[PDB]
Write a protein that binds this DNA or RNA. Structure first.
Ligand SMILES: Nc1ncnc2c1ncn2[C@@H]1O[C@@H]2COP(=O)(O)O[C@H]2[C@H]1O
Ligand SMILES: Nc1ncnc2c1ncn2[C@@H]1O[C@@H]2COP(=O)(O)O[C@H]2[C@H]1O
Lengths: 201, 197
DNA sequence: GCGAAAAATGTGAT
DNA sequence: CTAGATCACATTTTTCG
DNA sequence: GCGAAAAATGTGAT
DNA sequence: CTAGATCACATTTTTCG
């Protein structure tokens, strides 16, 4: 399949858990593709707080927002979540490749298009909702996220309050008090391993 | 170049001051092109409010997200800040134009990455800044803009308080109560006009 | 599948 | 314990015929 | 090159 | 008016050699 033409030119490498895959600011060097495992992508403010903006899992393409112009600094931080294998090709060679088969360039644009639907939703969520709203919404998202392991009354996830405050944009104390709130209503069962129960699965 | 070959196949239309060229929610088929004019992409909440998620101008492709996922919704709302001239091609045709001269595709994919980029910044200005912070860089970015006039020494953009309010995500009454404060803290001077120094 | 050490947490007036 | 929202309604600024 | 209506605004506790 | 951040350390639970 078309993928294998790229995945052959693209050098697979092992990256351990927590291993800072890409750093913000550097200069657009390679094009990356996750052949096993997962990744987190985050930015930080005036200086200090990091905020997650997306994860990405098997089959995505990291760092492609340079590719179409020259001299772009890295957009943001990309830090491995679980250990993963991120294969890669040099920008210059990607282009030459695009012409010998452009239906992978097609496949890239797909991700570069959907990621902005998701991201424009985010602006939505941080402008129109309040933290309880964002949290509730996010838990549903994460249930959808491939990470989840089923539990006989809803999708299970083992994430942490610190991280929710980080995706949600709020101090982890408020995560503590709201996750408690949605528990004393039966929307949530929660001990480190959280299960947001919506019935159906 | 690749541009004039591409365009030709596009029914060209002249939408007037504040038309609605894409209603959010509806069906996707048209990949538009502003051959002249300017757009304001919005998102709206079922209850009253909206957020100016982007300005788009001449040269920009529009309604591009449908194209790879067959069967979809029109992500947001495109309105019209001035009389424009927009071109149009059926997606399934555009897809054929891809597979004969693949340069036009790049030009959209590049239109995207720059967007993906500026929007991810928007995300952050919301999770990290004061209203003052926000209004402030909004008065800066609004000067890196095709429609702003190089006033005596600096940029003179016109844009109203409710307008800045929609971009920022803050109330109108705060916006005014605040930007005129960036005047004592001599960063701007205004009067309908916002003569960012 | 350990248990020492490393990380996450939560509670309240302002 | 601080930032920014929410009240109507005249005064004020802007809109082209 | 000028006059109505029309958009937009400011404020002030809380 | 009202929502959440927040300071600081006991205590609880999750990571890793
Ligand atoms: N909003 C976003 N959503 C998803 N991925 C993003 C977003 N912003 C940046 N990225 C990714 O993060 C990478 C960091 O810089 P690159 O230009 O290498 O490529 C970027 C994209 O792969
Ligand atoms: N983040 C964004 N920045 C700029 N324009 C956008 C953004 N999100 C959506 N749009 C544009 O608005 C269009 C709405 O309909 P489409 O999804 O067809 O395609 C969308 C884009 O062209």
């Amino acid at each position: 399949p078309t993928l294998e033409w790229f995945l052959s030119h693209c050098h697979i490498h092992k990256y351990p858990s927590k291993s800072t895959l890409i750093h913000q600011g550097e200069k657009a060097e390679t094009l990356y593709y996750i052949v096993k495992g997962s990744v987190a992508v985050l930015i930080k403010d005036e200086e200090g707080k990091e905020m997650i903006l997306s994860y990405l899992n098997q089959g995505d393409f990291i760092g492609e927002l340079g590719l179409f112009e020259e001299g772009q600094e890295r957009s943001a931080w990309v830090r491995a979540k679980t250990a993963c294998e991120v294969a890669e090709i040099s920008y210059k060679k990607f282009r030459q490749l695009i012409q010998v088969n452009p239906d992978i360039l097609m496949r890239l644009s797909a991700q570069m298009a959907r990621r902005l639907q998701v991201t424009s939703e985010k602006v939505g969520n941080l402008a129109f909702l309040d933290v309880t709203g964002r949290i509730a919404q996010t838990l549903l998202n994460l249930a959808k996220q491939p990470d989840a392991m089923t539990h006989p009354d809803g999708m299970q996830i083992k994430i942490t309050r610190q991280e929710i405050g980080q995706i949600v944009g709020c101090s982890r104390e408020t995560v503590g008090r709201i996750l408690k709130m949605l528990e004393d209503q039966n929307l949530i069962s929660a001990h480190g391993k959280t299960i947001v129960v919506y019935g159906t699965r």
